Amino acid sequence: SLWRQTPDLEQLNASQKNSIGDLLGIRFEAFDDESLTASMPVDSRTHQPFGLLHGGASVVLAASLGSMASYLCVDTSQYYCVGLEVNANHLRGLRSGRVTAVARAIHLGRTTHVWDIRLSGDDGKPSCIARLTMAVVPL
Amino acid sequence: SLWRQTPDLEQLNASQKNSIGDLLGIRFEAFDDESLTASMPVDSRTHQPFGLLHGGASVVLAASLGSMASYLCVDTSQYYCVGLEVNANHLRGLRSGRVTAVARAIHLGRTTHVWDIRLSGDDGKPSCIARLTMAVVPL
């Protein structure tokens, strides 16, 4: 019921062709009535120079997730979504494995959306939190 | 005088090998007594699905720039830098060309650094602004 357009994981993944998403290994994984989930590897592709997960790389995952989520909540025959503001806190560093991100809606207004995005590594300990604000703009 | 270690553009660029930086085309361009500048193409590598500049991609550039800047302001025999908090506002969309980012220091404390990062396209109109907070942590 959150979703206007019921999420299509294959199409979500397919639509990332020729994008920064596909380039970093982002993969949409699951969704339910209230959330959307994507993951990304912690490797060379996403590494900052030190073999650590680039804060940016975590932020790309969060931004891709939340903007896609927003896109599935609007009437896309009449509206599109643009990023307005984004913030994030680094909670724990990540070395190897994959980072998983889960988006939940905080507020879906007529003109803005606010998404809460929680990230964690394979041990499932929170590694990053982000809040994303999108603008809903008439097509 | 801002810099402890005087910036080495070649080495800065070289150190990005096998990183998300090199993957997106980030290139350190210039520096002066008070600032560091890097650029990135607005293309397929950095595109969100719609042929637009992924907000993440702007944020990677800002994060790479500011963390590198922070790294050049600490005694690296004793300290390293970790991202704590980052935020950004989308100001104008970007279609083609390159986005240029300039980092300036807001505050360099003993335990935290705050960097102001201004981004703009080739028309030189501001496209994004970011503020980055790094932690300085004993090695």
Side-chain angles (χ1 to χ4, degrees):
Chain A
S1 178
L2 218 217
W3 314 117
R4 181 185 197 262
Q5 284 106 14
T6 161
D8 200 349
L9 293 183
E10 195 71 29
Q11 185 215 283
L12 266 30
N13 289 318
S15 70
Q16 285 206 116
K17 185 59 184 175
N18 303 349
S19 289
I20 187 178
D22 210 8
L23 193 61
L24 306 192
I26 296 180
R27 160 178 178 180
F28 289 85
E29 306 271 15
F31 68 94
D32 56 26
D33 265 347
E34 296 186 294
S35 72
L36 184 63
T37 307
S39 76
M40 182 180 65
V42 191
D43 66 13
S44 158
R45 254 156 135 184
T46 51
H47 268 162
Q48 82 155 115
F50 286 101
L52 260 211
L53 184 58
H54 196 267
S58 268
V59 176
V60 186
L61 172 53
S64 285
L65 188 41
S67 72
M68 183 62 71
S70 223
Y71 186 77
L72 302 169
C73 294
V74 303
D75 170 6
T76 57
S77 66
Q78 280 179 303
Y79 299 96
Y80 67 103
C81 306
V82 63
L84 251 189
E85 215 273 348
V86 63
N87 54 78
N89 269 264
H90 170 287
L91 308 167
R92 292 180 173 88
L94 286 181
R95 326 296 199 92
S96 76
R98 302 181 67 80
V99 56
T100 296
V102 180
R104 292 181 211 278
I106 297 297
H107 168 65
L108 304 171
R110 310 163 69 197
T111 59
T112 63
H113 289 177
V114 179
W115 289 93
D116 168 72
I117 301 151
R118 310 296 174 105
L119 288 84
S120 75
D122 298 306
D123 55 27
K125 312 211 294 176
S127 57
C128 174
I129 180 174
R131 202 170 67 252
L132 177 75
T133 306
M134 311 283 300
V136 177
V137 290
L139 205 43
Chain B
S1 178
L2 218 217
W3 314 117
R4 181 185 197 262
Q5 284 106 14
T6 161
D8 200 349
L9 293 183
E10 195 71 29
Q11 185 215 283
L12 266 30
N13 289 318
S15 70
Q16 285 206 116
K17 185 59 184 175
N18 303 349
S19 289
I20 187 178
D22 210 8
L23 193 61
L24 306 192
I26 296 180
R27 160 178 178 180
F28 289 85
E29 306 271 15
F31 68 94
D32 56 26
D33 265 347
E34 296 186 294
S35 72
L36 184 63
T37 307
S39 76
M40 182 180 65
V42 191
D43 66 13
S44 158
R45 254 156 135 184
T46 51
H47 268 162
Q48 82 155 115
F50 286 101
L52 260 211
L53 184 58
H54 196 267
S58 268
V59 176
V60 186
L61 172 53
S64 285
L65 188 41
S67 72
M68 183 62 71
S70 223
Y71 186 77
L72 302 169
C73 294
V74 303
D75 170 6
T76 57
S77 66
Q78 280 179 303
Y79 299 96
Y80 67 103
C81 306
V82 63
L84 251 189
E85 215 273 348
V86 63
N87 54 78
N89 269 264
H90 170 287
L91 308 167
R92 292 180 173 88
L94 286 181
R95 326 296 199 92
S96 76
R98 302 181 67 80
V99 56
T100 296
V102 180
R104 292 181 211 278
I106 297 297
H107 168 65
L108 304 171
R110 310 163 69 197
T111 59
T112 63
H113 289 177
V114 179
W115 289 93
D116 168 72
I117 301 151
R118 310 296 174 105
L119 288 84
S120 75
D122 298 306
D123 55 27
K125 312 211 294 176
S127 57
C128 174
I129 180 174
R131 202 170 67 252
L132 177 75
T133 306
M134 311 283 300
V136 177
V137 290
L139 205 43

